[PDB]
Amino acid sequence: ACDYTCGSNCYSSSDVSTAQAAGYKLHEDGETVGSNSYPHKYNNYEGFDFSVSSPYYEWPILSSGDVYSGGSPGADRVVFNENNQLAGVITHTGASGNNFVECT
Ligand SMILES: Nc1nc2c(ncn2[C@@H]2O[C@H](CO)[C@@H](O)[C@H]2OP(=O)(O)O)c(=O)[nH]1
Ligand SMILES: [Ca+2]
């Protein structure tokens, strides 16, 4: 079973923590990857009720199991805060435009 299901993408907790760690490291070093400069601030326009405090940052999580290194980020993201605490896993899949919905 999946720990997080983003549309048809299935992620385990291990997939998430691996993605989060890579994203947080870049954040810590003040470096970005890709045309959209990941990781970057996640404004939470959606108003998700995250249990940890902001600011939030988003980093792509890939269904391939690889760590994001550039190119297309797909539709899924892991959201972490300044303390490297996991806020949530979100996706563009099933949401209109560039909006997000939470992975289940
Ligand atoms: N939908 C959405 N996009 C956000 C948010 N915070 C930052 N963004 C970024 O703001 C723009 C419009 O949604 C996009 O550049 C999106 O990038 P990502 O695809 O990298 O999330 C947010 O809270 N919601
Ligand atoms: Ca996996």
Domain housing 23: 1-104
Residue nearest atom 24 of ligand 1, based on CA coordinates: 45
Which tokens go with 23?
Answer: 């994203």
Which atom of ligand 1 is nearest the CA belonging to 36?
Answer: 20
| Element at 78 (helix H, strand E) | strand 76-81
Indicate the length of the chain as a whole number.
104
User: What resolution in Å is listed for this PDB structure?
Assistant: 1.8
- Whether the CB-CB separation of 68 and 37 falls below 8 Å is answered with no
Q: Kindly report the CATH number assigned to the domain that includes residue 54.
A: 3.10.450.30
Which atom of ligand 1 is nearest the CA belonging to 95?
Answer: 1
- The C-alpha atoms of residue 93 and residue 6 are separated, in whole angstroms, by 7
In terms of Cα–Cα distance, which of 64, 67, 54 is closest to 26?
67
Number of compact structural domains in the chain: 1
| Element at 19 (helix H, strand E) | helix 13-29
